[PDB]
DNA sequence: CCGACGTCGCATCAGC
DNA sequence: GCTGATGCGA
DNA sequence: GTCGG
């Protein structure tokens, strides 16, 4: 639909969602606010009371009440109230720094630290992830156009390809479903010499020649299997330089490869429609193996995947081509 | 009335 | 020292 | 907060 028809609705509830998460620490509050924001968000009709709402799935007897406050007074007391509380609205905007939940938040508050520029002055108390998302905290917050994110793809690819020439990699995200934007980069990895019953330096010899070439530039974390850093592109020439992107490099068996693939390109909207129109044919799908549920409820073996149309094989699905995947 | 409501890899904490 | 729990992000 | 066993 178009925001404007519930935005100010939606809105509400989702700045209502990151107080419950980041400051009341309710994390099924959080969710169901967002549900109800969802559900609202495409629904094609301009909401005239809370009664009209309640009818949707996800939205009750709470949320239907306070659409009608918005609805005859333009606004939420309660919302404004902790927007105005000093405590709660910086814990909820200290959450924003990547690194920083809603724990770590309440402790900063608690102490004084209530700023970026108190974290700057404090920065012994950070640890490692939270120095880069401060230190990033403009730049993880901007988005990525997608000629950067081919010129990404670009140099991943061909490094990738430049140390081993059987490895395996995919963009995926909604980067692989052909979006115009994406907020990060999620890279795929593997190697025929890695299978579930199966060396610890396929994830890291990847990770070092990119930072040979200066394409990665901090790490955020680092094990045998998955990476979160930070990227790069070379500024060319007089030009300005790039802003800091987040990416992801997971290292998955050749044989899960697929469903790993299918699992990260999403949608999330999508990977539960896939999830669920699934179970009915007695199947369900992990972001490892797909499960052939099973004359209890018993997970039986995973059926063999070796590529992602194979899957869609199992289920008697129209393999479905990644940019019709936001559903 | 009251429990379910996402899962998993890594960094760091709590505790022996 | 190590194991297990908790915080965190995606 | 919402839904349902
Ligand atoms: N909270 C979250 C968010 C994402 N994911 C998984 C499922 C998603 O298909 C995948 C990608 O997450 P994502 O980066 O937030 N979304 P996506 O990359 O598709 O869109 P943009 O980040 O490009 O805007 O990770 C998750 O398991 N838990
Ligand atoms: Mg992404
Ligand atoms: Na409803
Ligand atoms: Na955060």
């Known amino acids: ?70 609805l005859a007074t333009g606004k939420l007391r309660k919302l404004e109230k902790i927007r105005q509380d000093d405590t709660s609205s910086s814990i909820n905007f200290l959450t924003r720094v990547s690194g920083i939940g809603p724990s770590a938040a309440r402790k900063f508050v608690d102490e004084g630290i209530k700023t970026l520029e108190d974290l700057r002055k404090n920065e012994d108390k950070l640890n490692h992830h939270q120095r880069i998302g401060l230190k990033y905290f403009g730049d993880f917050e901007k988005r990525i156009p997608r000629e950067e994110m081919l010129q990404m793809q670009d140099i991943v690819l061909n490094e990738v390809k430049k140390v081993d020439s059987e490895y395996i990699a995919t963009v995926c995200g909604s980067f692989r479903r052909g979006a115009e934007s994406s907020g990060d980069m999620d890279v795929l990895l593997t190697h025929p010499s890695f299978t579930s019953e199966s060396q610890p330096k396929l994830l890291h010899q990847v990770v070092e020649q990119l930072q040979k070439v200066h394409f990665i530039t901090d790490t955020l974390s680092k094990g045998e299997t998955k990476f979160m850093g930070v990227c790069q592109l070379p500024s060319k020439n007089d030009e300005k330089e790039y802003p800091h992107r987040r990416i992801d490099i997971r290292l998955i068996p050749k044989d899960q490869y697929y469903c790993g693939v299918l699992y990260f390109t999403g949608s999330d909207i999508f990977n539960k429609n896939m999830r669920a129109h699934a179970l009915e044919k007695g199947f369900t799908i992990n972001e490892y193996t797909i499960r052939p549920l099973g004359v209890t409820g018993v997970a039986g073996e995973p059926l063999p995947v070796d590529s992602e149309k194979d899957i869609f094989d199992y289920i008697q699905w129209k393999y479905r081509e990644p940019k019709d995947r936001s559903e």
């Open 1 to 70: 639909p178009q925001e404007t028809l519930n935005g100010g609705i939606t809105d509400m509830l989702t700045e209502l969602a990151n107080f419950e998460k980041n400051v009341s620490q309710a994390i099924h509050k959080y969710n169901a606010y967002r549900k109800a924001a969802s559900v609202i968000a495409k629904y094609p009709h301009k909401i005239k009371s809370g009664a009209e709402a309640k009818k949707l799935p996800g939205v009750g007897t709470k949320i239907a009440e306070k659409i009608d406050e918005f």
